[model samples]
Target: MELTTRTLPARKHIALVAHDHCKQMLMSWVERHQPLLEQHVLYATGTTGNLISRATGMNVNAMLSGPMGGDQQVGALISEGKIDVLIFFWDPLNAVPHDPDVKALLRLATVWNIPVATNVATADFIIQSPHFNDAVDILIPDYQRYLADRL
Candidate 1:
């Protein structure tokens, strides 16, 4: 699937996630992108969001903790077209409690053609893009049907 792009002011939403072990790393990234982040909405997992919120004083809406389905929650948002970008810090070496949710989150992001940053390198690109007002194409692919097939 191909994701449509537009100007920054017209961009879609961004989803954030991080495992317990990587929460600090995520926070550092947030601090670096605080300026750009203030412009768009961010949805994060429980503990990670709370930590970042405390550190940055930004109201980050957090769902359940990662071990308790937060990753799947973000996946649902991506499937619903509510999220355009995904910034996730996942530790491949560590065994996450909710492995399925993590996998599903990654799968859904790819299927929806959303921009997903699994590491700091890609996350920096998303945060520092010169054209901050990038827009997302809401009518590109049939995500509903695609999700149904995956089921």
Candidate 2:
């Protein structure tokens, strides 16, 4: 089966975050995709944002550092319907010290139905997916707790 490619908008809002170990890896990917990355508005957490900006030379909006409540700040943007895509290079092996912050961010993203990229592979797929177009509207799911048992 042939995979049909979809065209994303000329510009879209994208959020990026990376753990300490993955920062370099994330920077490399962003550098390679600079042409595409430049077309969109990029938002990032403090350290990650600084690194990406220096690496890509793109004006990325930096929020607070993740441990310092950056994740929640970014989540707020997601909740307010301000962000489109999220790319977070999480360190699975190492447990993050700030569990509450991470959990809150994840919950908000889930509650708001945001697309997340937790690893490099997923990030590539998301970036290349035809489903990234703003033309394609996202439908929010609604179900009642008492009625969901039927499924």
Candidate 3:
């Protein structure tokens, strides 16, 4: 794939996701970061979005449930460069039938150079980064050029 640069806006488009037993922990983290988070665009998978909204009274763009296709939805957004960040609280202790989808979503986020946080520590680190709220430039695959060259 060819490379290109994209600048993320100061107000980022953040996508949140959590698996099973990890949901509560993700919600707690969101509450803790509500002040800064409220200023950004928040997207979440299924009930996670609703829960975050209730906890912080912030608007959360909701997607389908993970098992029901939320992961793919977010992955699509990431691939299209519509999502700038990913905050996913995944439960390593439990297995879900939608593991393939989860894997694909993470892969898409990384491929698009979207900052991803899979745990509380990483989440904190990501949210605390000085660039988190500033417009930032990143290198990404030039999909159009790739298609043009190969197709």
lDDT of 2 by residue, 56-139 (tens): 689999999999988988888876668777888878778889777877877777766667888888888988877664545553
lDDT accuracy of residue 41 in candidate 1: 85
Best by lDDT: 3
* Candidate 2 regions with alpha-carbon error over 4 angstroms: 1-10, 141-151
Residue 65 lDDT (model 1): 87
**RMSD list, candidates in order:** 3.5, 6.4, 0.8
For 1-151, candidate 3 gives per-residue lDDT tens digits of: 7899999999999999998799999988988888999899999999899888887889999999999999999999998889999998878998889999988998888889989999999999989999999999999999889889896
Choose the strongest candidate by TM-score: 3
Model 1 residue 124 CA deviation (Å) reads 0.8
- Stronger candidate by TM-score (2 vs 3): 3
The superposed Cα distance between candidate 1 and the true structure at residue 79, in angstroms, equals 0.5
- The worst-scoring run of ten residues by lDDT in candidate 3 lies at 47-56
What is the lDDT for 86 in model 3?
96
Candidate 1: stretches off by over 4 Å: 1-11, 136-139, 143-151
Q: Write model 1 residue lDDT over 82-149, tens digit each, in one string.
A: 87789889988898768888888898888767778999999888667755465534345655565677
